[PDB]
Design a binder for this molecule. Structure first.
Ligand SMILES: *[C@@H]1O[C@H](CO)[C@@H](O[C@@H]2O[C@H](CO)[C@@H](O[C@@H]3O[C@H](CO[C@H]4O[C@H](CO)[C@@H](O)[C@H](O)[C@@H]4O)[C@@H](O)[C@H](O)[C@@H]3O)[C@H](O)[C@H]2NC(C)=O)[C@H](O)[C@H]1NC(C)=O
Ligand SMILES: *[C@@H]1O[C@H](CO)[C@@H](O[C@@H]2O[C@H](CO)[C@@H](O[C@@H]3O[C@H](CO)[C@@H](O)[C@H](O)[C@@H]3O)[C@H](O)[C@H]2NC(C)=O)[C@H](O)[C@H]1NC(C)=O
Ligand SMILES: [Zn+2]
Ligand SMILES: [Zn+2]
Ligand SMILES: [Zn+2]
Length: 266
């Protein structure tokens, strides 16, 4: 996700935290954001480009083989140089494990919990963006150049931002708070209300991130690359049809995140 998906994922996520998980996140965050996890959820996307954190480059996504439309961890979860574990699935396990050393305080200074908090949170949102588990050769839709209404863009960016900016301008006067309030609603008393417990049962972290990944490449094959030719124009038909899918994954990411943190801090 771009700024917007992450902010909503995290606001949603923070509102569902138990007492132990709220206390931890407040303490783990710098004063200048007033306890607001959302304020920093983009942080990993900034440092993505610093030589220092070059190593975080591949942890944002998974590249699956073209047209295969499924996710296999040992096949997929690696970087370009075949280095095992380097993919958003790995990172979530990694940063969740790091965070389990917080309460007991048993990692000395090998880890930074604040950074582990922002990576976990951020990457929880990325793994639900269906185009973060897309095809290798086209870079999760990045190198499928298209037009989204009256400006150049690309499929990956349609899902990272366009559908969300578009929805917020057309229906909420650009106010993202409002778009979130409705997304928050559609699973509390709304179309996804009967599904919360179902979103919350995936097993241990490893299984969960595999479930989430799988979900994403299905959505990507069914709704992402379907009905998309390069150079063409995606209109009201693509937007209106996919709006609620994007919205679902914003919610799923958030509910799923609150569950992890709740467990890591409990
Ligand atoms: C764990 O990692 C954390 C993230 O990497 C570390 O926290 C970071 O610590 C650095 C200290 O070097 C902070 O950067 C400083 O920011 C302050 C204040 O920033 C605020 O004010 C400016 C302008 O007034 C504004 O633009 C900012 O947005 C803030 O409102 C500056 O005075 C310094 O020059 C310096 O840049 C980061 O704030 C902080 N990041 C986060 C996410 O907390 C932390 O140090 C690590 N822990 C340990 C023990 O090493
Ligand atoms: C799990 O989280 C930790 C951060 O706590 C990550 O550790 C980092 O791993 C990367 C890549 O494996 C390291 O890059 C290395 O740079 C040094 C040169 O200083 C070199 O010895 C290595 O060949 C490699 O290029 C990075 O330095 C290291 N950082 C820390 C603080 O440990 C780890 O990558 C994470 N793994 C996953 C799958 O999320
Ligand atoms: Zn993102
Ligand atoms: Zn993206
Ligand atoms: Zn990212």
């Amino acid at each position: 996700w771009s700024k917007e998906g992450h902010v909503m994922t995290c606001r949603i996520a923070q509102g569902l935290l138990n007492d132990e998980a709220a206390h931890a996140v407040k303490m783990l965050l710098p004063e200048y954001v007033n306890g607001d996890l959302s304020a920093l959820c983009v942080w990993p996307d900034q440092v993505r480009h610093w030589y220092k954190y070059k190593w975080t480059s591949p942890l944002h996504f998974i590249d699956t083989p073209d047209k295969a439309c499924n996710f296999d961890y040992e096949r997929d979860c690696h970087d370009q140089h075949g280095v095992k574990d380097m993919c958003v699935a790995g990172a979530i396990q990694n940063f969740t494990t790091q965070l389990s050393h917080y309460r007991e305080g048993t990692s000395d200074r090998r880890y930074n919990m604040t950074e582990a908090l922002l990576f976990l949170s951020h990457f929880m949102g990325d793994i639900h963006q269906p185009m973060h588990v897309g095809f290798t050769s086209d870079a999760g839709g990045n190198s499928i150049d298209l037009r989204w209404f009256r400006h150049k863009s690309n499929l990956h960016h349609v899902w990272d931002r366009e559908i969300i900016l578009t929805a917020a301008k057309d229906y909420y006067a650009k106010d993202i708070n409002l778009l979130e309030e409705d997304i928050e609603g559609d699973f509390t008393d709304g179309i996804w209300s009967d599904d919360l417990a179902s979103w919350r049962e995936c097993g241990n972290v490893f299984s969960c991130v595999n479930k989430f990944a799988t979900e994403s490449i299905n959505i990507a094959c069914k709704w992402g690359y379907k009905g998309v030719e390069a150079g063409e124009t995606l209109s009201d038909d693509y937007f209106n049809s996919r709006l609620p899918i994007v919205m679902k994954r914003v919610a799923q990411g958030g509910i799923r995140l609150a569950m992890l943190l709740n467990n890591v801090f409990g």
